Amino acid sequence: SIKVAINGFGRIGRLALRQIEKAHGIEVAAVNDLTPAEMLLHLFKYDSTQGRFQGTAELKDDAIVVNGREIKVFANPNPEELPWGELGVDVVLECTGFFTNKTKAEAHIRAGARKVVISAPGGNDVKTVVYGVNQDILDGSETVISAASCTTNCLAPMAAVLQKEFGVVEGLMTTIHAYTGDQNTLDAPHRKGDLRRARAAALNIVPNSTGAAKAIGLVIPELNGKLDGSAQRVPVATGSLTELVSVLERPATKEEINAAMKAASSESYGYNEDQIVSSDVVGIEYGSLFDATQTRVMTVGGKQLVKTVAWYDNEMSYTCQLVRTLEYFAGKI
Amino acid sequence: MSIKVAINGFGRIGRLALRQIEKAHGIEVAAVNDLTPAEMLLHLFKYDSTQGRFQGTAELKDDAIVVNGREIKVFANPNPEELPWGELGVDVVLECTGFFTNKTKAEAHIRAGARKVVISAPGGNDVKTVVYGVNQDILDGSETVISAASCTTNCLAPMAAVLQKEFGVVEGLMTTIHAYTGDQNTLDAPHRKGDLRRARAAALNIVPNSTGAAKAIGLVIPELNGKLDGSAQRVPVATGSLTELVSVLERPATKEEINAAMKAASSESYGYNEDQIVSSDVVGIEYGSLFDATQTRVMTVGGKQLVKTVAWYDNEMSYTCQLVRTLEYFAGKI
Amino acid sequence: MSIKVAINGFGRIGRLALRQIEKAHGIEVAAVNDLTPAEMLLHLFKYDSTQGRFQGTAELKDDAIVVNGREIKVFANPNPEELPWGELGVDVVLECTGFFTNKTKAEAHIRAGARKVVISAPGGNDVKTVVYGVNQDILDGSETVISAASCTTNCLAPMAAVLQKEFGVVEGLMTTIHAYTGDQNTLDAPHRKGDLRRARAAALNIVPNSTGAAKAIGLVIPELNGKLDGSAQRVPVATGSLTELVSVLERPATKEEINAAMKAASSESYGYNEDQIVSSDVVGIEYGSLFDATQTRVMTVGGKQLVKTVAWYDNEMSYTCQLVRTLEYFAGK
Amino acid sequence: MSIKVAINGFGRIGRLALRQIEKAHGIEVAAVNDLTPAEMLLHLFKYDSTQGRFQGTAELKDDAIVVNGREIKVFANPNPEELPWGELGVDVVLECTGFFTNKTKAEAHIRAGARKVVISAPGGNDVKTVVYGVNQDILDGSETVISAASCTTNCLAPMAAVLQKEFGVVEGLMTTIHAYTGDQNTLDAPHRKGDLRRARAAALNIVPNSTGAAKAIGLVIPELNGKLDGSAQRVPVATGSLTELVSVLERPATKEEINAAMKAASSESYGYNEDQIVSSDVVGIEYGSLFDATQTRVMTVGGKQLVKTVAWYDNEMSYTCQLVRTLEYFAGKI
């Protein structure tokens, strides 16, 4: 069994534990956060958007017992100091939001873990994997990898189909995204100086940057430098979508685009034809859910603008992609 | 000028229209019509969950409300043909119910004795459609029914007009991220218009929905006829919206030149913003559209450019002020 | 033979009742009636913003929905007198429209051929009112129309019944902090029934509103007739509520004694909670009422005691489960 | 001449305090201190998601903001003893950070050279605690550190004082249905203070939580010492709250006697309401407490009565106005 430690027992970290409990041959030996075990256990059991944990979870001294198995709990904010080698940790899921580059994530390796998966973009010098698009770039010799962002896992399969079947000249993305924990509850100073994330999360449409489109070349080299975009955070607590407006290399119709997406569907990339809304993707296990109902092709003379839209639960969709990537990576190491 | 106005549909737009007309010279509201007793209309005029308390005096008088000392008759007749507009001497009806949005239905107010109608929505192809600050000069005063377009059209049109005038537009796709409105259900339930997405709980969901603002832009800007399309995402803010436009232009551009052109085009109708604002910051603004220079993007790949421009609007108050500006301009010509 | 149910009003309660009846053995919904095309009802049944996606299959056919492989007829007649209940062999109608909540109106279903009706709301003076787990034994089977009370009554009654049996209640005042419901407007607008407070935007406001649940408690617990009163505060959660009761008891009490008495009375209808939960944690629960022992207070000042007790309920699913329990018991008698 | 004030903690309360002091004659803010660059503080002062745009001018300068043409110094020192209050001639510090809410910690501002401090929160049992309009007469100006109590105390106290004065209170249990605040998390996450309920997503949940407002009421109304307790239910409105009190009184009472007594006690601090209002209607009000006569209830069973009284408050702006009234009164006691 591959032993996992979760660093940062937050939204992604706790959902990752839920998904890993369902995965054979991989188990979480430890979690680390900033708080006593009682707090972590409570938040694991009870979840405002993802529902009650559907298993048993009990408290023990400096440990939680999940489905009858003990998971040690630590509270050390500095990863290099954690007893990963001493516990026999194979892979750390780095989910704190504070160690999202190679140099910082490698602290887990100095602590004795064999591998790290960052639950976020990790820079250009770590292999970046959207499961179902480019996991074959891993051979197991990597030490630190990235599972990209939630938006990258939504955008990439949609962009891959467009590039493969039509060719992409260029594109601009907008993700309409659930608010997240990096926004304030009420208007207040923001630690990272972001005047827009400073604002009350559940009261506002909040423009904000995202690198998901700009960095797409790490996942789909044929799209390198061809896409850009940004985000609008809105008052849903989870559930998001990505719109892509593209110029393609050949003419296209709505029906041809939709058929190509359906033909590419998989456990990671779903295909939808129902008139759904964001609450309907909460808890889905696709990394991306293409919505054929929103496809649009604007034609003026010989020039076309193409809109394609995919949903994602930025929490659970990304988490399932993260665990698929971890499982594949763990088979290679 | 001196013109007596009646408001048909004392809803979000109708009530804010009264607030703005109370501030406008030469225009007075003589009557409102809705489906409810005067006490309910008075209460909703005084107290407003998003736009704040009415900053004037408002009192109940039998089947009338007294606003800033002046009596406004209240009617509750769902059939506009039966309203006593001729007997009250109404010059212009603001048609704000959502149920009479074409020339034939709005003309019921004329048969009822009013001289003119302004529809607070798109009004069909045989009705002039005016975005104040873009094309009010098409009005000569002889029209009987006009439209002030939609909230989204009033946001989009000044921004698209600048791009067309200064750069030329090949084509473009619009997305408006829009506050939820009264046509969505409070909780998941059957929807009278059959819309499976507006059936869903308004304050819990990102809700895709159609909009005709881009497709119909040619009624306001003829040079853009057939060049734009788009759609909407309704989201859980109770008012306050923005419109994104992704365009192909006829000449190269930088964000700085785009922003400068928008600033040079600014007016009381079309504002220019450089602050890092969010939707709550546009609630209650009186611009029809507020261009956000901080969101402009120009993507260039092999000399081929995609341009994103974004403008905010309070779909309630921005639109209402545009409606009242269009009303004043029209009323000066009748 | 299967007890055949028809649901009149395929709304929040009606659709969740179908979900629960599909899980109930020996009970099946033969038909639903509303004001709506089958395609829209099917869509609302499958996708639910607060209760989640329907777990099962649901497909469209002409004038029917097929749920778990079984056909359910859909009608659209606003006049219950004209519904074909006798022709379908309907045993019990769940009257969930909100418009036919007294004996005279609900009897339209009996003239239409149904044997019995359960109103999903208070039902007026000619109707027995049943909170399952408190007073179902008042039924003798000769009734044609009964009421399963209100959501708040099913929350309050088991808690109040324990206090009365073990301590005696002199008097009490209730406040229910209640999820907003479909009788409030989305944004400020005229309210058809003239309620100046329910006219206001539901998700933006604390909204005081009247409720007769406490004052009418004597219909369920006769010994409390005339002893309780209270009101509601509607707040911006889309489902999930709680009932606070401030009572004067006839004998001295401690927090521990009250909590133990509630636990000793727990059942499938009345749950007992000791965790620090919040409203999202009761979304979808199947208890009619969930006593929250963490909120019990007994204040003693100069030999006089005032007691606060609090129970949670999902006004949607808690009530729906109580309604179905009452339906099963009533149909067995 | 103006009383010179410094604001420590430029948060919800701190920023609204500056707004109110800018409107008050004879009081001015010389400096604010927080943990952030001036550009962030200016932005948050200008734009407010619940209280609206600042109705003045506000511009940035080097380590200063200029508000209505007057420069206000900005510091970013987390240690209050090091602030240059003596050097600026500060008369009163508003301590609004939440981190220095007792006598020993708040006295850091006195050691730093300020003459007086008002803590914007309960400050413990050894500091005088003032609800303006109830007990400001306990101050004679020789104090250095006082407390303006909590938002809930300023709501509860005027209502409870009337009941005690006119009827006598045996005991009572309070529930405040309270807007969520910044001490709750945006989404479920570990909470620094170990509160399993404030850990949960603020805008998705009814959140039970403790409050000391009723238990400490004796600091404000000594005759009620030990007679009240209560708790809070935090709910998804971003500001605007109400307090329910269920009381056992020393003599029989009717709804009319209670309501008439509240109206007779009304003032700039304690409002009297008879309209069917909801929480959004009290956002930005300047009363410390707004009694709601429509919610009064007296239940009688035999000779035993239970009395329910309810008052609204904007936990932000109502309390801020009380804080500034207390500041003004205290600074005048020379």
Ligand SMILES: NC(=O)c1ccc[n+]([C@@H]2O[C@H](COP(=O)([O-])OP(=O)(O)OC[C@H]3O[C@@H](n4cnc5c(N)ncnc54)[C@H](O)[C@@H]3O)[C@@H](O)[C@H]2O)c1
């Ligand atoms: N939430 C989403 O939609 C989402 C989607 C994809 C990726 N991500 C990424 O996942 C990461 C986590 O995001 P989240 O939403 O789970 O945030 P979160 O704030 O819910 O979780 C972060 C957790 O890390 C803990 N933590 C912080 N610093 C720590 C330290 N030094 N040592 C140990 N624990 C520490 C916090 O206590 C918290 O529990 C970020 O990189 C984020 O960008 C988030």
Ligand SMILES: NC(=O)c1ccc[n+]([C@@H]2O[C@H](COP(=O)([O-])OP(=O)(O)OC[C@H]3O[C@@H](n4cnc5c(N)ncnc54)[C@H](O)[C@@H]3O)[C@@H](O)[C@H]2O)c1
């Ligand atoms: N809300 C916005 O963002 C917005 C912006 C621009 C335009 N509009 C347009 O303005 C119109 C009104 O929208 P709203 O948001 O004010 O809706 P609303 O539902 O708040 O107001 C409509 C009012 O009309 C009344 N009404 C309905 N039928 C009536 C009849 N037959 N006779 C009299 N009164 C009747 C209703 O009682 C209600 O008070 C619609 O056409 C809408 O498209 C709305």
Ligand SMILES: NC(=O)c1ccc[n+]([C@@H]2O[C@H](COP(=O)([O-])OP(=O)(O)OC[C@H]3O[C@@H](n4cnc5c(N)ncnc54)[C@H](O)[C@@H]3O)[C@@H](O)[C@H]2O)c1
């Ligand atoms: N939602 C709750 O929390 C809750 C809890 C307990 C009881 N109730 C009660 O249950 C009833 C329904 O409440 P809801 O929240 O489900 O309301 P809802 O508005 O969601 O559903 C009512 C349904 O009845 C339909 N309908 C209306 N008139 C009809 C007619 N003449 N014939 C057939 N169908 C018709 C509507 O189209 C709608 O689908 C009410 O009596 C309510 O008080 C609701």
Ligand SMILES: NC(=O)c1ccc[n+]([C@@H]2O[C@H](COP(=O)([O-])OP(=O)(O)OC[C@H]3O[C@@H](n4cnc5c(N)ncnc54)[C@H](O)[C@@H]3O)[C@@H](O)[C@H]2O)c1
């Ligand atoms: N918000 C309310 O409803 C309300 C009502 C009454 C009283 N209060 C009380 O007022 C205080 C502030 O509450 P708030 O809601 O404004 O909180 P807030 O978090 O919005 O503001 C506190 C500010 O203090 C700053 N700060 C923190 N530590 C600091 C330090 N060491 N030095 C300088 N600045 C520091 C923070 O950056 C923040 O800007 C608390 O005591 C609170 O209990 C709040």
Ligand SMILES: O=C[C@H](O)COP(=O)(O)O
């Ligand atoms: O603390 C919150 C996390 O950083 C989540 O924010 P993100 O998913 O936007 O990076």
Ligand SMILES: O=C[C@H](O)COP(=O)(O)O
């Ligand atoms: O009832 C609500 C009105 O019809 C507003 O809806 P709309 O502005 O989306 O048309």
Ligand SMILES: O=C[C@H](O)COP(=O)(O)O
């Ligand atoms: O649609 C509205 C119904 O009457 C449900 O609301 P209620 O449960 O508050 O009666």
Ligand SMILES: O=C[C@H](O)COP(=O)(O)O
């Ligand atoms: O961080 C925010 C404030 O400390 C809120 O504190 P409060 O909830 O006690 O007002």
Ligand SMILES: [Cl-]
């Ligand atoms: Cl004195």
Ligand code: NA
């Ligand atoms: Na496992």
Ligand code: NA
């Ligand atoms: Na006027």
Ligand code: NA
């Ligand atoms: Na069944």
Ligand code: NA
């Ligand atoms: Na001043």
